[PDB]
Structure formats: C-alpha cells, structure tokens
Amino acid sequence: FHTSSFCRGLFSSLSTNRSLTELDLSDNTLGDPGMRVLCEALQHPGCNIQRLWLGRCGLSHQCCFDISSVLSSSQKLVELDLSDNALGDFGIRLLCVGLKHLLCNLQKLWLVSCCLTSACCQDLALVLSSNHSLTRLYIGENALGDSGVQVLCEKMKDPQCNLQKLGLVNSGLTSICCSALTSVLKTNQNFTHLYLRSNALGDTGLRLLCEGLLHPDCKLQMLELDNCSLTSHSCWNLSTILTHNHSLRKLNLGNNDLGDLCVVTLCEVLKQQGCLLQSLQLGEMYLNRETKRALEALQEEKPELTIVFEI
Amino acid sequence: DYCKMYRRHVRSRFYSISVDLNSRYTQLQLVKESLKLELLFEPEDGHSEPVHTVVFQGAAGIGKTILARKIMLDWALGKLFKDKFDYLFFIHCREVSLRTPRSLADLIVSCWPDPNPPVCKILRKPSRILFLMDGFDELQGAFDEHIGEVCTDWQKAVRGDILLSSLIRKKLLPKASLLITTRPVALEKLQHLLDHPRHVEILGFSEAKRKEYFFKYFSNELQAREAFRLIQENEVLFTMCFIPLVCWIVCTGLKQQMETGKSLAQTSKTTTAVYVFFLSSLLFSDYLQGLCSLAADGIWNQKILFEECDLRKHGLQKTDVSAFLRMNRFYSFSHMTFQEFFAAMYYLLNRDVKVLLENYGKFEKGYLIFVVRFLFGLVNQERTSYLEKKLSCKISQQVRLELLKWIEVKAKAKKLQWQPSQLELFYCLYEMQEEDFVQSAMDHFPKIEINLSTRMDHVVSSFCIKNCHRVKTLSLGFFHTSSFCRGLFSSLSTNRSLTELDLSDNTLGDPGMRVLCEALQHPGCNIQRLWLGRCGLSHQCCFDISSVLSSSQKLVELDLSDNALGDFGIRLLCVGLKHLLCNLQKLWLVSCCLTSACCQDLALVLSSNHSLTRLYIGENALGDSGVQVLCEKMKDPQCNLQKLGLVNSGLTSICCSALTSVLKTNQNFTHLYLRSNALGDTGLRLLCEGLLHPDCKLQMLELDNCSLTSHSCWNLSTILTHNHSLRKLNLGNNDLGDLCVVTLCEVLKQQGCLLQSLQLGEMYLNRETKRALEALQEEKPELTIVFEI
Numbered sequence A: 001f002h003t004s005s006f007c008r009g010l011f012s013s014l015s016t017n018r019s020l021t022e023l024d025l026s027d028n029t030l031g032d033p034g035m036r037v038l039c040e041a042l043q044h045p046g047c048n049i050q051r052l053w054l055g056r057c058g059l060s061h062q063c064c065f066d067i068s069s070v071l072s073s074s075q076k077l078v079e080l081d082l083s084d085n086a087l088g089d090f091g092i093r094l095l096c097v098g099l100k101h102l103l104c105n106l107q108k109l110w111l112v113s114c115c116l117t118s119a120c121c122q123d124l125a126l127v128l129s130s131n132h133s134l135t136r137l138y139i140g141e142n143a144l145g146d147s148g149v150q151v152l153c154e155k156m157k158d159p160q161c162n163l164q165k166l167g168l169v170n171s172g173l174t175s176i177c178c179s180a181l182t183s184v185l186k187t188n189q190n191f192t193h194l195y196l197r198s199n200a201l202g203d204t205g206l207r208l209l210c211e212g213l214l215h216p217d218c219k220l221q222m223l224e225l226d227n228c229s230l231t232s233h234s235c236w237n238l239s240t241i242l243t244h245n246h247s248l249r250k251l252n253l254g255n256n257d258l259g260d261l262c263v264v265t266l267c268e269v270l271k272q273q274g275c276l277l278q279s280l281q282l283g284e285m286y287l288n289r290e291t292k293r294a295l296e297a298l299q300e301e302k303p304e305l306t307i308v309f310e311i
Numbered sequence B: 001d002y003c004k005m006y007r008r009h010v011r012s013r014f015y016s017i018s019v020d021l022n023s024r025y026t027q028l029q030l031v032k033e034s035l036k037l038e039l040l041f042e043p044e045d046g047h048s049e050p051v052h053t054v055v056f057q058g059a060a061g062i063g064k065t066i067l068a069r070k071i072m073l074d075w076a077l078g079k080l081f082k083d084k085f086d087y088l089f090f091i092h093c094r095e096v097s098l099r100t101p102r103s104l105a106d107l108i109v110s111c112w113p114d115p116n117p118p119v120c121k122i123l124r125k126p127s128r129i130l131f132l133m134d135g136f137d138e139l140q141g142a143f144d145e146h147i148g149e150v151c152t153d154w155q156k157a158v159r160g161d162i163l164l165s166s167l168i169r170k171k172l173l174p175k176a177s178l179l180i181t182t183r184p185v186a187l188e189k190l191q192h193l194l195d196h197p198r199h200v201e202i203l204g205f206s207e208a209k210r211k212e213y214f215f216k217y218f219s220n221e222l223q224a225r226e227a228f229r230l231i232q233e234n235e236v237l238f239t240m241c242f243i244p245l246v247c248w249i250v251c252t253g254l255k256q257q258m259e260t261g262k263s264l265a266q267t268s269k270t271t272t273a274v275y276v277f278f279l280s281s282l283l284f285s286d287y288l289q290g291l292c293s294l295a296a297d298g299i300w301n302q303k304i305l306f307e308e309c310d311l312r313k314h315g316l317q318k319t320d321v322s323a324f325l326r327m328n329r330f331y332s333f334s335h336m337t338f339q340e341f342f343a344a345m346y347y348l349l350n351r352d353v354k355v356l357l358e359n360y361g362k363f364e365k366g367y368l369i370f371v372v373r374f375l376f377g378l379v380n381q382e383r384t385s386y387l388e389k390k391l392s393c394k395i396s397q398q399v400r401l402e403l404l405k406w407i408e409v410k411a412k413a414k415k416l417q418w419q420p421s422q423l424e425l426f427y428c429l430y431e432m433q434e435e436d437f438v439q440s441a442m443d444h445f446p447k448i449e450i451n452l453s454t455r456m457d458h459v460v461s462s463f464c465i466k467n468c469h470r471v472k473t474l475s476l477g478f479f480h481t482s483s484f485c486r487g488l489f490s491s492l493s494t495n496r497s498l499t500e501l502d503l504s505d506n507t508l509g510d511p512g513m514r515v516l517c518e519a520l521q522h523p524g525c526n527i528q529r530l531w532l533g534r535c536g537l538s539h540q541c542c543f544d545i546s547s548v549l550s551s552s553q554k555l556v557e558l559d560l561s562d563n564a565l566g567d568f569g570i571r572l573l574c575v576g577l578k579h580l581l582c583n584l585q586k587l588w589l590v591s592c593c594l595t596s597a598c599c600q601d602l603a604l605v606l607s608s609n610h611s612l613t614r615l616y617i618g619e620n621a622l623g624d625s626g627v628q629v630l631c632e633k634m635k636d637p638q639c640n641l642q643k644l645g646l647v648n649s650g651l652t653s654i655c656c657s658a659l660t661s662v663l664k665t666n667q668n669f670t671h672l673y674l675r676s677n678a679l680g681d682t683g684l685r686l687l688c689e690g691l692l693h694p695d696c697k698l699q700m701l702e703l704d705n706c707s708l709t710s711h712s713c714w715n716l717s718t719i720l721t722h723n724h725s726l727r728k729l730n731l732g733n734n735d736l737g738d739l740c741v742v743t744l745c746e747v748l749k750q751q752g753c754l755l756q757s758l759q760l761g762e763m764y765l766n767r768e769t770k771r772a773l774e775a776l777q778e779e780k781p782e783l784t785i786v787f788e789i
C-alpha cells in the first residue's frame, strides 16, 4: 500500500520457507518487474507454494514469460489466478508454452477479464491436448466470440480431454457456437459444469443446447443461463430437458422473460418423480399469483427442489 | 434558367452509356495517394493551395470514364455541386483534335446543346465552372517542346495541347476548376505542370460491390446468384473481377452461354484469357485482317474517330460493322482495350514486330505494353493452337523468340527509367502461362524488385517467383496482409536460390511478420539475409524471430532498425540468440526504443554466441549504466565482437573507463563509434588511457559531435604518436582550436604515424591552419583529410 528491492528482500526468504502453500497478492500494484522478481523467487526448489492468486496485480504480457518459466520449472503449483490483468492474446501465447510443458501440474486457471480476443483461443486449444491436469478453466468476460468458442470446442470434443468446468461469462456469444457446445456435450464425458450468462444465445441457442442435452451420454451437472435474453418459444425444449436429462442437477434462469405459462409448465414437469433436479433459480422477474401458488405447492410436496423464485 | 436546361440536356446525353447508366452503375473504391465522392473539393487542411487541381489514376477499364459520366449525371440530377458549383463542363481528348487550333468557346459550344450559348454571361464566375479532361493519355504529344507557349485568351484559337497546358497551370481562368482522369503510367512530367494537385487512385469493386454489379447486370436473380457462385468457384477470376470491365465481359459471356444452352462453368474454368474466350464464344479472314489493320493504323496515328478512308485502305466495307465497333459517318471502338487487343492479334495472323519493341515511348502512357500483353497472351502454345483452330488462321512463331530477345533487352539495359516497371513484365509472364519459356526468359532476373497494391499483384508475384529458379536478391513493397503474406511467402520457403530478402519500410504489421516467420523456418529456404527496417514490428514478433534463429542455421545477418522492440523484445530475442545453433554475424538494433535494462541480457549473448561479430545498438537511451554492464562482461578476450556502435546513446565520461578496459583487454574490437555523446575532454583522456596500451587493436574511433575541447589535445597528440594500429578517425563538430590543428599537423608530419584517414568537417579554421593542412597533404598524399567544410 503506497518495489523491486522490496520484492527481492521479502521473497528471498519465501523460497526457503518449507511450510507456505497459499500466497495471496490480489489488488497489489506490485508491477511487472516485481512480478518478475517473484518469479525468480518461486522457481527455487525449496518453495512449496501450491497456490498463487494475482488478481488485479497490474501485470502485462511481460510477466507471462516469467510465469511460463515458473510453470515449466515448478511441479508443486496447483491453481493460478490472473484475473483482470491485460495479458492479451500475446500473453496467452506466451503462457501456453509453459502450460503445454509435460511438467505443468496446473488444475485451476482463472483468466477472467484478461483483455483477450479469439486469436488466443487456438493456442488454448492445444493446452487441452497437451496438459491433462487442467481440470477447470474460467475464460469469461472476454471478447472471445463465436469464432474463438468454436475453435476451442472443435478441438475440445475429444473424450480424452479432461476439462470439467469451463466458463464463458459475458463472452458476447450467440447461437452460432451452440452447435459446437452441443458437440462437446454429446462427446465429452467429464464436462460437468458450464456457464453462459450475459450471452445473447436466444431460444434458438437454447434449442441447440437441448440438441446435445438430450443425448444419453450427457454428463452436464449444471448449466447457467442467467441474463441470456431468452424467451418462451423454446420452452418445450426446457420441458424436454427436464423430462429426459437424468444427470443435470442445477440450473439458472435469472433475467429471462419466460412467461407464466412457461413457469407453470416447468412446475408440472417437475411434479413427477422422474426428474432428479436438485436446484433451480428464477430470480428477478414479475410472475403471477397463480404462479406463486404453483411454486409454493411444488416446494411443499417435494422440499428437496430448492427454488430462488423470489426476487 | 440557363443552368436548369443545360443540366437537363447533359442528363439526356449521359442517361445511358443502349444500356442505362445508373441502374448498371456500381460504387467503386478510391483512396487519395477512403475518399468519399461527396467529399471531393473541400480542403481537408485550411491552407490548401487551389483545390481546383485534382488528378485521377486507374487501370484500363477501372471506370474513369464511368466516374466522369456519373459525376456529370449527379450534377445533372440535383445531387452534387448545387450549392457549391453551378456549371460543369465535359471535354474529351478524342473529340478535341490537337491538329486543329481551337478556343474555350469552341469547347463550350460543343458541350452546350445550343450552338449559341450566352458566352458573355457564362465567363464571369469561373469558381462555379469545372472542366473535365478524361482520357488524358492523348494530349502530351507535343508538351515536350511546347513548354514555353502560353495562351490566356479564352477567345484565342491555339492548338488544343498548348491551350490545355495553359489551363493546367492555372493561368487561363486561373480560379476555374479542373478534373483530370489519367492512366498512372506517365504522370512524371505532368506533375511539373501541376500546381499543388491531389492524386487520387481508383481501385474499383469490392466483394459486396461485385455482388451488387452482378445483381444489377442480369435480369434474373437466380442467374445472377449462379454467376456469383461460379465466380467464387475460380479464385483467380474472382480476384480479376475487381475491374468493372472484366465483370461486364464475364456477365455478357455468361449471358451468351446460358441463352445458347452452353454451360457456365466453362467460363469459370477459363483463366487469364477472358477476352479471347469471349470473342470465341461471340462468334471471315478478310474481316479479321481489315479490322486488325484498322486497329494497328489507329495505334500508329493515335486516331480513334476513324473515317471511311481507313476502311477503304484496309479493305473494310460497309457490312463490316460489329458489336465491338460503333457507328455514330463516324467509326469508333466501344472500349479502347478492345482496339489494343485487335492490334495485338494483328501481328500474328506494317507487320514487322520491331515497331512494338522499339517505338514504345512515342505515345504518352504507353498503349503498346497493353497491346504487347495480349501478344504474350496469344503466343502461348495452347492459346496459339486454339486461335488457329478456332479462326482457321496461322500464327507466326519467330515473334516468340523476338519477344524473348526483347525480354533480355529490358532486363539487362542500363537506362531503365524510360522502360515501364518490372511488374508489367510479371503481368506479361503470368498472362502467357507457358512454363518452359517463362523459366528460360526469367532466369535473367538475379535481383527482383516489385511493389504490390492489389490481389492481381500478389497472384502474379506468387506465380512468377514460384517459376523463378536463379534469383538472389528479392525486395517487396506492400503499398496500400496475413493472407497476402501467406500466399507470397509459401513459395519462398520452396525457393532454393534466394539469399537476400528486403522488406524495409513495408508496414506488413506484426501478424504478417509472424507468417513470414513460419515461412522461413522451413528447411527448404536458403535466405542468409533479412532486413526489416521500419517494418512497424513490436515485441510480439520477437518470439517468432527467436524461434526462426533457433531453428535456422543459414541466416547470417539481420536488421531490426526503427521497430519499437523494447527491452522486453530484446529479452525475447536473446533466448534465440543464445541458442547454440544461431549463426548470426551482423545485428542491427538502431533506434529500437531500448533502455539500459536490456543491456544485461545482450551481455550474455556475447558469451553464448561467438558468431556475432559486429553489433549496432546506437540511437538508444542506453546510458552509462547499460554501457558499463555490457563492457564489464565484454572484457573477456574470448569475446568475438568487433564493430560495436553507440551513436547518440546519451553517454558521458563515466562509461569511458569501461571502454578503456575493453580496449586494454580485447584483441578483436577493431571499430567503435561514439558520435553525439557528451564524452568531453575527460572522456577522451579516459579513452586515451587504454588507447596507448601496446595490446590495443582499435582500427577506428569516431568522435563526431562529441562536444570536445582543446584541453585534452595533448592526449590526441599522444594517441597519434604511440598508437601504431589506429588507422582512421573523426572529429566533426569539435571545437579544437587552431593550436590543436597545427599540433595535429606537426605530429602527423613524422614517419612514425601510420594514420591513413582523418576528418575535420564543419569548423572555422585559420589561413595558417589551411596552409599547414595543404602542406601536410602535399608531402604525404596518403593521409586523406576532409578538413574542408
């Protein structure tokens, strides 16, 4: 709170510390040379850090070279955060060299709001077939777009891909990439969670998602759709998804004008014992009194199916 | 009102080009050397010299005539030049014969519908009057001798060329407006006659504009869509369709094909021979000979408005008028390119081909090359056979050998200014499409320089370079490119002869540089030299270049001057440089926006790479810290660096001790540059400290503009008296004083000094100083001096 000399003097001892496991440095404007000095500190064999969060650190593409060296040299790191640093597509291109290294043990990788574009996506694709320890990815709040999402997914469809909890919050997508996502759901057997909020998917996009959701080989255990700007036309598709998907166990429909008929049809679909859904949200809309009675009833006979219908 | 009826008359004249103009019209792309058509005459800057001088350039069939007629019709329809101008006039070179002297009154009367215009009323406000000169390629027939003939009377009857030349320089109606449309070939002299013009080039259709044109041509939407699809079936034809004339020809050909039942894919399959295939699909030897001779005599005589006498001479009769020709009696070709095509076809059915070879240049902007282009089109063995078997005629074959000899004449000549550009030669060699003779007549280009500005340029360059097999030096110009770079540089990796590749000043960008990097690292390429000055690169390209260096062992030198690589970019490069397989020898890094921080990394290179001989890191904010860091690690005698340079590095005497250590230790550090550094006399003394060392090897020491003085002057004397190895020097912009110069003289007098050059440029010495310098030059002539300012 106001540092190359500062960073050296502090982090020299941290490499010799054999007990440290988590290192938080969020919101510190330690700058890029400080991040470099931290990188020379970490890659010492003594340090036992398994966790490094660097949100809003003010880094840039320059630190990515050093971080790639750290990843290629250190086998104890588990997750890593880089949210809200202007890494850019070049920064991602630099990171992927370290990520693709056979000794990279990364599992959780945040890249939220890293000022990326679709161009970096191709490189990221290679990671999924070079690194198998990468379980969950978070590349939301970037101008990826349909081209980038398609590039990532087309290479992601391999069942050997180990990715689980991808997220594309506020990626500016539409229904075009939904076919690729459908292919991913049809093929992958480990892609459990998936986020899509603030994307203009539309009812056509939801139908395209349903195309792969109904697949008997599906494994999706959640599908966020908040603020997707949906409508009541693909509502039969929602009914079909609930009636046939025995694996999906959560959902989100916030800021989606579905209409009273849709809510009551959701209710009557949920009534039967053939649905294993265990959570659902309808936050922030204006429903009807009959709708409220139906929701209260369904909560009454089955208490497991939690709803956040109240705004 | 007079303007209203005049506008109605010119609307009636320019309604059609027959076929309606506006309905078939499609927008074009133009850029000032995009500039909107409504934004022509207002000055972008408030201090523009008279805006009335704008010149237009474009290819054959680009639409200069169509643009002129479209702007005239807009002025006739109430669209443009209503609140700005009031009168627009049309003048044509073909109609205005140069042999008959005329006046502006004649042109106005011809343009006015009424043969009795109010000449007194319409010659008072030239600001609202714009004169259009289209097809300027028929005016400079005597400008090379009529430079000093000037006419300023609007009613005076003087030769058309002289009067128009008077109009151009803004002296006859100087405040009136002018709009000239020209071929870009021969503007070199015309710019002398121009008083602050604006040169605007016309580029033609884009993809959407092409689709719009096919929609506006065919009356059937489905047929237009099928034509569009088959155009995209052939990439070459789709690229060629950026010229509206080619679009018109292909649309007419497709119409003829589908009306007669012929398939449309055959047109797409036909490449580079649109005119010949179109003529064959449209359709006798006497007719062909007569039309060809008419075109040839029009070529010689610069005549387009043929009369009956020409047809009588050529044997052409009244029943010999076809679609290509036009009756108005007046005979005129519909479009000139057809006339040059017929003239080219003439010489294969004066018949001496040498007139095309040597009499080029007698006509401005060179109609002949275009002619000769179709010649390379027709002499193609398959195309020659097709012509013979489709017209039952015979084609001469010695013409091909004569064209070969002309190719070597063009390639090996000295006075290359008058000849057209080499890109025209590449257009010809792509037009012909005969592999073996392309290779044979193309092995005569060891060095290739081309400037590319369109898809046609890229395609012909790719084909030509792929055909090349013995080229050493190659340069490129991207004068306005990831797809462009891929299409070109894919072949360069397969080229086993290239050794030098110049790309300076091209704004190829960073992704283009990346694509170039994937092109180079292929094992096939034999490039030993890559210059990239002012390429506009950045730190991103450094990763790719480092990969290239670590993967390629044929590269020798490399230039990166004036790119904002930065210290991070240097950090990225050093990884490739430190690689054991890097064979770099010469590395320029001038003005790379570096700082001292990168210097440390550079130091490692000198002890990781031993092939790096000479370095040039001048014009950077390195400073004393960076220079000391570099030198302290450079002092090892095993370091192989020779010709380091630190021009304008902002140094002072602090780093001079480190430089002294380098000179004392290193045995290969021959040259060294220090200009524009505030070293001072203390710095020069510190340099002398190591200069006097018996182990020194410094063979030059530049000191220009170092801001020296006369206090360390004894040190200069000592350096000359003791250094037996130093053989050059520079002291420009250094106030040393007369005593210093004369002491330098007397020191140099003795035979113990082996200095072989010295400079004292740009100072104010004495008469005695000049006599001493002249004397020392007299007794020993080897010691050259540039003392004279």
Ligand SMILES: CC(C)(O)c1coc(S(=O)(=O)NC(=O)Nc2c3c(cc4c2CCC4)C=CC3)c1
Pocket: B058, B059, B060, B061, B183, B184, B185, B243, B337, B370, B421, B423, B424, B456
């Ligand atoms: C060097 C430079 C800039 O390309 C140039 C210099 O001079 C000229 S031009 O004025 O001769 N115009 C043309 O050749 N147009 C033209 C072209 C193609 C095909 C045709 C034509 C005319 C009919 C068929 C293909 C590319 C250009 C152009």
Ligand SMILES: Nc1ncnc2c1ncn2[C@@H]1O[C@H](COP(=O)(O)OP(=O)(O)O)[C@@H](O)[C@H]1O
Pocket: B024, B025, B026, B027, B028, B058, B059, B060, B061, B062, B063, B064, B065, B066, B067, B213, B244, B245, B248, B335
């Ligand atoms: N703006 C345009 N819209 C539609 N067609 C055009 C346009 N410009 C040129 N053309 C085509 O080009 C032909 C005329 O070319 P022209 O303007 O005489 O070339 P240049 O101006 O180089 O002499 C016509 O047949 C027409 O089909």
